Design a protein around this motif. Structure first.
Motif, PDB file in Angstrom:
ATOM      1  N   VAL A  55     -25.935   2.217 -24.173  1.00  0.00           N
ATOM      2  CA  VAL A  55     -25.110   1.240 -24.874  1.00  0.00           C
ATOM      3  C   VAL A  55     -23.838   0.960 -24.074  1.00  0.00           C
ATOM      4  O   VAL A  55     -23.357   1.800 -23.302  1.00  0.00           O
ATOM      5  N   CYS A  56     -23.321  -0.260 -24.223  1.00  0.00           N
ATOM      6  CA  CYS A  56     -22.077  -0.725 -23.624  1.00  0.00           C
ATOM      7  C   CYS A  56     -21.170  -1.275 -24.720  1.00  0.00           C
ATOM      8  O   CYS A  56     -21.575  -1.399 -25.879  1.00  0.00           O
ATOM      9  N   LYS A  68     -18.523   1.414 -15.131  1.00  0.00           N
ATOM     10  CA  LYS A  68     -18.276   2.696 -15.772  1.00  0.00           C
ATOM     11  C   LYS A  68     -19.557   3.511 -15.737  1.00  0.00           C
ATOM     12  O   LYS A  68     -20.576   3.092 -16.298  1.00  0.00           O
ATOM     13  N   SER A  69     -19.502   4.677 -15.096  1.00  0.00           N
ATOM     14  CA  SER A  69     -20.676   5.513 -14.899  1.00  0.00           C
ATOM     15  C   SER A  69     -20.593   6.788 -15.727  1.00  0.00           C
ATOM     16  O   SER A  69     -19.510   7.340 -15.956  1.00  0.00           O
ATOM     17  N   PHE A  70     -21.758   7.248 -16.172  1.00  0.00           N
ATOM     18  CA  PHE A  70     -21.910   8.510 -16.877  1.00  0.00           C
ATOM     19  C   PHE A  70     -23.027   9.314 -16.230  1.00  0.00           C
ATOM     20  O   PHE A  70     -23.966   8.747 -15.661  1.00  0.00           O
ATOM     21  N   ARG A 121     -25.960  11.869 -17.003  1.00  0.00           N
ATOM     22  CA  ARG A 121     -26.824  12.508 -17.986  1.00  0.00           C
ATOM     23  C   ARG A 121     -27.534  13.697 -17.346  1.00  0.00           C
ATOM     24  O   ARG A 121     -27.150  14.847 -17.559  1.00  0.00           O
ATOM     25  N   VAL A 147     -14.399  -0.275 -21.296  1.00  0.00           N
ATOM     26  CA  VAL A 147     -15.854  -0.165 -21.264  1.00  0.00           C
ATOM     27  C   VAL A 147     -16.253   1.275 -21.564  1.00  0.00           C
ATOM     28  O   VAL A 147     -15.684   2.214 -20.999  1.00  0.00           O
ATOM     29  N   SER A 148     -17.223   1.440 -22.464  1.00  0.00           N
ATOM     30  CA  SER A 148     -17.739   2.740 -22.869  1.00  0.00           C
ATOM     31  C   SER A 148     -19.247   2.774 -22.640  1.00  0.00           C
ATOM     32  O   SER A 148     -19.965   1.841 -23.004  1.00  0.00           O
ATOM     33  N   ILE A 149     -19.725   3.858 -22.024  1.00  0.00           N
ATOM     34  CA  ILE A 149     -21.112   3.966 -21.577  1.00  0.00           C
ATOM     35  C   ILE A 149     -21.700   5.279 -22.077  1.00  0.00           C
ATOM     36  O   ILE A 149     -21.115   6.347 -21.862  1.00  0.00           O
ATOM     37  N   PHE A 150     -22.859   5.202 -22.739  1.00  0.00           N
ATOM     38  CA  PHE A 150     -23.567   6.408 -23.145  1.00  0.00           C
ATOM     39  C   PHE A 150     -25.078   6.193 -23.133  1.00  0.00           C
ATOM     40  O   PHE A 150     -25.590   5.307 -23.829  1.00  0.00           O
ATOM     41  N   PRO A 151     -25.816   6.982 -22.351  1.00  0.00           N
ATOM     42  CA  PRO A 151     -27.286   6.989 -22.442  1.00  0.00           C
ATOM     43  C   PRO A 151     -27.740   7.551 -23.779  1.00  0.00           C
ATOM     44  O   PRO A 151     -26.952   8.222 -24.458  1.00  0.00           O
ATOM     45  N   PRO A 152     -28.986   7.306 -24.199  1.00  0.00           N
ATOM     46  CA  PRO A 152     -29.422   7.740 -25.539  1.00  0.00           C
ATOM     47  C   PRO A 152     -29.483   9.255 -25.697  1.00  0.00           C
ATOM     48  O   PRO A 152     -29.321  10.031 -24.755  1.00  0.00           O
TER      49      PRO A 152
END
Lengths: 437, 215, 215, 102, 409
Positions: free
Chosen positions: C137-138, C211-213, C215, C119-124
């Motif tokens: 996005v996931c 999965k947490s990121f 920002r 799983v890959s997580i990124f806010p815009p």
């Protein structure tokens, strides 16, 4: 097969002889009047298999019929062959169960599951080689390629599409090799020469021009060709009958040996002569097994009939109530798997009920006497069953207990067996246990 | 074998001539029919025509709506649609060639026709690229445009790598999507790529580089 | 008209198993010598190709593992063995005195490769905020089955509203389904939070894969 | 039914039997107790046992037929051996009479 | 336009074919059923096959509806060999183009007019249950469909109340001795009409024709009523096709109506007309399709009430038959009309030992009995007892024709 070439000959009637085909539709004496054959159609190997009993004294067979004119005609020929033993050990063919082949182009397991139960170490049929290759892997999945399972197929196996094949050691035959075209032509030339040596005993039309009358001397020549015996052909003595029927009284017997048709023997007139080089079986045996293994499970069907049978509803645990006799001894119970029939019609419950009465203790004493194991059932019809005519098929069919037993779906029956001529005609009987009126 | 074409965007009640190209066979030796496949997985068989056109058949909804025609020289028999509605928003194929033979055997990749009264607009594509960079995703947001179908490929059609194209919700009849590919972080904290957000019904081919926001 | 009913609509079997694909009709569609139907297959990205004729008759070179049968109202298909290349879109079409009714349509899943995806997580980004939207996005491609339970969370708040889904087919090289997702926000809510995370449950994940990121 | 279909003399009553045929024995048992039915033909043993057990029921005449009860076996079964001999053995000790006492 | 073809070998009645054509009332037309040919007094079947190739050269033909004014089942066999092989559905109404005897192909499309032989046997059972007679023999030659024929008749007798208890079958594939062997007041027989002259000569030699015995033949060996051999005896009754009112403009209009209705289903529900063919051997590349080409609409057709459903016997399921009686002047005279499982009354000529018997109802010596309407009207051991129809005394009070059945002491 040039069919209309033959069909045009049936108006200006010509004696024709058949060289190649073994199709049984050409034996129809209504349309194929004067169409003789150098080779009989494939029903002759049913007579070969009727010779195969008392080769090794074999006495059980289960058949599969191709739902077609070929399998039906071969079945009729072997049925007429089985009408014998009018004397004056009784170990002849007695299993004789018939099933159907041609809808097994997709699924044969419904037939093979029934085939693996009923004490069969038997050969079955000739079939189309594609579905034969299907049942070769199907019965191997069901393990009918074992040691005791005797296997023999016939003529259509020898085609190359049957090479998803035949567990090693399975008997094939070769009745007429015959494919020398010199021997095909010149023996027919000798037949028609001995024919015309009597046709000189003193005219057809001009073909298909206006005159459509039947040349009657053709059918008059048919009776003379019913006498042209050619005992000195290249294939030996050439014989005939009323419809083709070469009457070649020899064959040659081979079996597989790592897919090699190793010859086991021959036939000579009345002497099946085995050149016994090697005896192979599908389990790799060298003996000659026969018969079967006798089972010991008997599923007896009945109807509720006091005081012979007391069908009673069981308790909440499925067992019967611990009821006693007049001296405090408990009545012997049997969990009898009945039909659905807790109500008229089709109830949702199909519950095994209890069983008391005459025949329950009688059957328990008989099972202790004969020392065999035990199963139970009840009849879903609830009737004794008469030979009622099936609608639009003019066939009178039994119902009830005789709808199951004569269909082979059930084992032996204890019942209020009212005895008539017809039930004795289809069911063998013991001596009367309880005389009645 | 066959190629059904002539699609695109059309309004409600509009007109469109659908094309069906014969590729590699004689054309007047069998029977023709045309099917439409919905995105809801339903078969809208359109019409039946004869090899001379002497047997034209419509069902009841096609009666009074759509028209079939022949181009017997170019071997590209046409369907001329009219009074189009939102249930006609579907893919569209053909079905022929059983050689009397009254079934149909040849279906193609076909084309897509959508029937909606929204205004066709080029999209707004903006990149999604992380910056550690522990978990990375090379994506883009595509949002506020019209119409479907949508063909988002990456690196000018040279990278397949499991592209995941989005279905839509419609905010003021200009729907929004997304697109997302992940290459690993060993080969891309820096190696910038392009993205071809090509919408054929919008008839646009935009180019947006996928640049990371952070390092 | 005679109607076709097919079951199970989402078929999930194992390879080597004699997979049974049933089809029940509303009226007998056969006679003594023949019957009018045609069963076939395609991938959803592929043109339809004919497979089975009239009840069972084989076309050009399909693998003979498929074996269809049935008569009257019932119709079956034995897939023995099953291959990994059978993630197909397919049914049969009724033709008995009416070449217009089509089947219900069953879909193929393969009960072989249960797995937990990466799983890959990124806010815009910052240039993404010019459109006004905000898509976190996931991505997931190693898992079975297809339909999974996707959750999202922003600083402890459940954000199931505005969740975009993208379920694609299972890979024929892997027998594992593939999914990517976005969490569509607006541009004002993006500049107030930092923790944007997805959750996803599968067969090999009793707990949802989080999965947490930051920002 | 087969016996009265065979007898051409009983064919006159055979249509009345077709008019009032019954599915089970309990229907004909209850129907004479409800006096709709006046007569039911059956084997002697069940009728004697029911007349002894249930009252208001008597049998009138004598043996109209004479028969016995055997065991059903498919033809050329090997278990045709010893079954009638076991019937004779149950006759030898009077085990049938023990079943009657039961 | 739909090229169809009619030919009747022998007739000169083209105006009846135009009256059967009658293309102005056809409000419900498909693609136009064009039909035109010329007749040719020729029985050569290879010439017919070259004429089939001539029609395929005329490029319009798909099916024909033709016949001939002979009794030749050999051409029906030829149709089964050829037209059943390639494509052709053919309906034929006259003689041997109606009389089908040998077989029907499984891949066939053609059909010949007339009822099934067991259906005709059922008609004989109906009329002989009307006259209360019972066959006490049977003689039969070898013909296709004979074992099932006698099995169906005997199995129908087994289900009845009063049956034909007989003297089982003498199949004739000592002739005077074998015909002196069986004896019956009413005799049911079958023999080929060409062999029936010699068979009736043998029957006159054994005296069976002179014992007051009646002989009943089916219609297929009761071929055309204008020529009877002299050795064919007198007083023979038979059931036959309607030779009296069913001629050319009925049969051509019926064939064209059946063909056009099969068309206007086949090119309407499915919107698919088949292509006409050009060669008589090289057309095989498209007629291999034992397929949707095989007609289902052929077996269910009615036009202005006249139904035609036919089974897989080559015989229709709703026939209209007349009952004819052979006079002493070799004249077949119609005595009764058989519609679908019903009879007509007008000419019940049922025929010294014949003595008049009068009685009055007094118990228990007399009728206490009605007539069962269904299963053998007088049931068992009961002579039919006719009663005068006591009506209003302005018309005729009918003697008989309300009956009871006498039992009694």
């Amino acid at each position: 097969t040039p069919t209309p070439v033959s069909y045009t000959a049936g108006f200006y009637r010509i004696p024709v002889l058949g060289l190649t085909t073994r199709m049984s539709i050409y034996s129809d004496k209504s349309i194929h009047l004067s169409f003789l054959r150098t080779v009989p159609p494939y029903s002759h190997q049913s007579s070969v298999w009727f010779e195969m009993m008392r080769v090794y004294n074999w006495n059980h067979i289960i058949l599969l019929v191709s739902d077609d004119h070929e399998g039906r005609a071969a079945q009729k020929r072997l049925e007429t062959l089985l009408e014998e033993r009018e004397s004056k050990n009784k170990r002849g063919p007695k299993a004789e169960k018939v099933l159907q082949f041609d809808p097994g182009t997709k699924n044969v397991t419904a037939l093979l599951m029934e085939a693996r139960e009923l004490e069969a170490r038997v050969i079955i049929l000739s079939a189309s080689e594609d579905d034969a290759a299907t049942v070769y892997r199907a019965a191997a999945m069901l393990d009918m390629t074992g040691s005791g399972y005797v296997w023999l197929v016939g003529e259509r196996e020898i085609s190359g599409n049957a090479l998803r094949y035949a567990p090693d050691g399975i008997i094939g035959l070769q009745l007429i090799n015959g494919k020398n075209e010199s021997a095909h032509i010149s023996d027919a030339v000798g037949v028609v020469a001995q024919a015309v040596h009597e046709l000189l005993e003193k005219d057809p039309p001009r073909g298909c021009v206006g005159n459509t009358n039947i040349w009657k001397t053709g059918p008059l020549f048919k009776r003379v060709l019913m006498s042209s015996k050619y005992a000195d052909g290249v294939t030996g003595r050439v014989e005939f009958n009323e419809d083709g029927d070469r009457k070649f009284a020899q064959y040659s017997i081979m079996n597989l040996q790592n897919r090699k048709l190793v010859q086991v023997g021959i036939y000579n007139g009345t002497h099946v002569i085995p050149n016994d080089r090697k005896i192979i079986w599908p389990g790799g045996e060298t003996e000659k097994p026969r018969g079967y293994q006798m089972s010991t499970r008997l599923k007896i069907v009945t109807i509720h009939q006091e005081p012979f049978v007391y069908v009673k509803p069981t308790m909440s645990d499925g067992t019967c109530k611990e009821e006693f006799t007049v001296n405090g001894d408990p009545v012997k119970k049997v969990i009898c798997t009945g039909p659905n029939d807790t109500s008229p019609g089709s109830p949702r419950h199909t519950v095994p009920q209890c069983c008391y009465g005459f025949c329950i203790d009688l059957l328990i004493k008989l099972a202790r006497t004969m020392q065999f194991t035990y199963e139970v059932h009840l009849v879903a019809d609830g009737k004794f069953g008469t030979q009622e005519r099936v609608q639009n098929s003019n066939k009178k069919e039994w119902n009830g207990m005789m709808g199951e037993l004569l269909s082979g779906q059930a084992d032996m029956i204890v019942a209020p067996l009212t005895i008539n001529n017809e039930r004795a005609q289809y069911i063998e009987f013991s001596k009367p246990f309880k005389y009645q009126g | 074998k066959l190629q059904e074409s002539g699609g695109g965007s059309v309004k409600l009640g509009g007109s469109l001539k659908l094309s069906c190209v014969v590729s590699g066979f004689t054309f007047s030796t069998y029977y023709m029919s045309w099917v439409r496949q919905t995105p809801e997985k339903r078969l809208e068989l359109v019409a039946v025509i004869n090899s001379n056109g002497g047997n034209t058949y419509y069902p009841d909804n096609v009666k009074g709506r759509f028209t079939i025609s022949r181009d017997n020289a170019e071997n590209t028999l046409y369907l001329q649609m009219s009074s189009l509605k939102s249930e006609d928003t579907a893919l569209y194929y053909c079905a022929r060639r059983d050689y009397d033979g009254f079934a149909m055997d040849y279906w193609g990749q076909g084309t897509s026709v959508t029937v909606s009264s929204a205004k066709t607009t080029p999209p707004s594509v903006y990149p999604l690229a992380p910056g550690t960079n522990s978990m990375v995703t090379l994506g883009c947001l595509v949002k506020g445009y019209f119409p479907e179908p949508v063909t988002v490929t990456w690196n000018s059609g040279s990278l397949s790598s499991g592209v995941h194209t989005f279905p839509a919700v419609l905010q003021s009849d200009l729907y929004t999507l997304s697109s997302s590919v992940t290459v690993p972080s060993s080969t891309w904290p820096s190696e910038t790529v392009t993205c071809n957000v090509a919408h054929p019904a919008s008839s646009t081919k935009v180019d947006k580089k996928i640049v990371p926001r952070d390092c | 008209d005679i109607q076709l009913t097919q079951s199970p609509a989402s078929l999930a079997v194992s390879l080597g198993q004699r997979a049974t694909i049933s089809c029940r009709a509303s009226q007998s569609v056969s006679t003594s010598r023949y019957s009018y139907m045609h069963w076939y297959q395609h991938k959803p990205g592929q043109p339809p190709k004919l497979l089975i004729k009239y009840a069972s008759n084989l076309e050009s070179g399909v693998p003979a593992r498929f074996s269809g049968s049935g008569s009257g109202t019932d119709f079956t298909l034995n897939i023995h063995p099953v291959e990994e290349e059978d993630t197909a879109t397919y049914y049969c079409q009724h033709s008995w005195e009416n070449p217009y009714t089509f089947g219900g349509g069953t879909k193929l899943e393969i009960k072989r490769a249960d797995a937990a995806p990466t799983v890959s997580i990124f806010p815009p980004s910052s240039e993404q905020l010019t459109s006004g939207g905000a898509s976190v996005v996931c991505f997931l491609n190693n898992f079975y089955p297809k339909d999974i339970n996707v959750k999202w969370k922003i600083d402890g708040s459940e954000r199931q509203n505005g969740v975009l889904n993208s379920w694609t087919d299972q890979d024929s090289k892997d027998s594992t389904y593939s999914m990517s997702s976005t969490l569509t926000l607006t541009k004002d809510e993006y500049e107030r939070h930092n923790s944007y995370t997805c959750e996803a449950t599968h067969k090999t994940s009793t707990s949802p894969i989080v999965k947490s990121f930051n920002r | 039914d087969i016996y009265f279909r065979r007898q051409v003399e009983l064919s006159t009553m055979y249509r009345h039997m077709e008019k009032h045929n019954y599915e089970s024995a309990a229907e004909a048992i209850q129907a004479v107790r409800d006096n709709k039915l006046h007569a039911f033909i059956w084997d002697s043993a069940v009728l004697e046992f029911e007349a002894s057990q249930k009252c208001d029921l008597v049998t009138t005449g004598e043996l109209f037929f004479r028969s016995g009860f055997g065991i059903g076996m498919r033809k050329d079964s090997p278990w045709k051996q010893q079954v009638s001999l076991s019937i004779l053995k149950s006759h030898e000790n009077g085990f049938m009479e023990d079943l009657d006492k039961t | 336009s739909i090229g169809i073809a009619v030919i009747l070998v022998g007739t000169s009645d083209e105006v009846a074919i135009k009256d059967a054509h009658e293309k102005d009332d056809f409000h419900h037309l498909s693609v136009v059923p064009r039909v035109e040919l010329v007749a040719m007094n020729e029985t050569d079947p290879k010439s017919i096959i070259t004429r089939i190739c001539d029609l395929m050269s005329d490029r319009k033909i798909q099916g024909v509806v033709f016949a001939d004014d002979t009794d030749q089942e050999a051409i029906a066999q030829i149709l089964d060999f050829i037209s059943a092989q390639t494509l052709t559905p053919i309906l034929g109404i006259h003689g041997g183009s109606s009389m089908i005897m040998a077989d029907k192909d499984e891949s066939s499309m053609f059909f010949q007019f007339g009822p099934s032989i067991e259906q005709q046997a059922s008609v004989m059972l109906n009329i002989m249950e009307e006259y209360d007679w019972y066959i006490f023999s049977i003689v039969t030659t070898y013909f296709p469909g004979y074992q099932d024929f006698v099995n169906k008749i005997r199995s129908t007798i087994e289900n009845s109340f009063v049956g034909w208890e007989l003297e089982e079958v003498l199949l004739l594939d000592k002739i005077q001795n074998q015909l002196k062997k069986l004896q019956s007041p009413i005799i049911l027989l079958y023999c080929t009409k060409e062999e029936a002259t010699y068979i009736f000569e043998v029957a006159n030699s054994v005296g069976l024709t002179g014992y007051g015995y009646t002989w009943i033949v089916p219609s297929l060996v009761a071929g055309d009523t204008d020529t009877v051999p002299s050795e064919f005896p007198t007083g023979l009754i038979s059931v036959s096709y309607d030779e009296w009112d069913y001629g050319l403009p009925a049969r051509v209009r019926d064939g064209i109506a059946i063909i056009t209705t099969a068309a206007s289903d086949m090119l309407s529900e499915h919107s698919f007309i088949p292509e006409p063919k050009s060669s008589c051997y090289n057309t095989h590349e498209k007629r291999i399709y034992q397929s949707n080409m095989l007609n289902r609409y052929l077996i269910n057709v009615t036009f202005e009430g006249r139904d035609l459903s036919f089974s897989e016997d080559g015989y229709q399921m709703h026939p209209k038959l007349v009952i004819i009686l052979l006079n002493k002047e070799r004249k077949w005279e119609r005595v009764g009309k058989w519609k679908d499982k019903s009879l007509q009354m007008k000419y019940y000529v049922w025929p010294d030992d014949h003595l008049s018997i009068v009685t009055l109802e007094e118990a228990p010596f007399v009728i206490v009995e009605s007539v069962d309407p269904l299963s053998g009207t007088c049931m068992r051991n009961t002579v039919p007892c006719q009663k005068r129809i006591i009506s209003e005394n302005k018309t005729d009070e009918e003697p008989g024709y309300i009956k009871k059945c006498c039992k009694g002491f």
